Ligand binder design. Structure first.
Ligand SMILES: CNC(=O)c1cc(Cl)ccn1
Length: 116
């Protein structure tokens, strides 16, 4: 509270670390459904069903232009990508399984990087 400071982590490497993690996502072989925005004019139903589209290149642009206040908002966008994927794609589809794979890959990188 006011004048009662909570010890907080050193965040100075966060930006660099998130860029690193995002580069690893982008270079993963199953990243292909997520590299670019879904083409809302070629994909039937997506615009109406998915209220907040997100993709890696958009995350990269936001990361590169100071649009993430902190680690957590970055992680929210990454998770949104896989959340949208699950919403729209069958689990037993190539894109659906890509999503589950990429999510798992992210969470491991995330844990390995930031959680002790
Ligand atoms: C993340 N990409 C998708 O969810 C998607 C799904 C379909 Cl069917 C076509 C293009 N993109």
């Amino acid at each position: 509270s006011m004048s009662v400071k909570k010890p907080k982590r050193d965040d100075s490497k966060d930006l660099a670390l998130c860029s690193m993690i995002l580069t690893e996502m982008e270079t993963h072989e199953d990243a292909w459904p997520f590299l670019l925005p879904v083409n809302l004019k070629l994909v039937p139903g997506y615009k109406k069903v998915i209220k907040k589209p997100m993709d890696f290149s958009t995350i990269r642009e936001k990361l590169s232009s100071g649009q993430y206040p902190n680690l957590e908002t970055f992680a929210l966008d990454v998770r949104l990508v896989f959340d949208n994927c699950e919403t729209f794609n069958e689990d037993d589809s190539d894109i659906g399984r890509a999503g589950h794979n990429m999510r798992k890959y992210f969470e491991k990188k995330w844990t390995d990087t930031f959680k002790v």
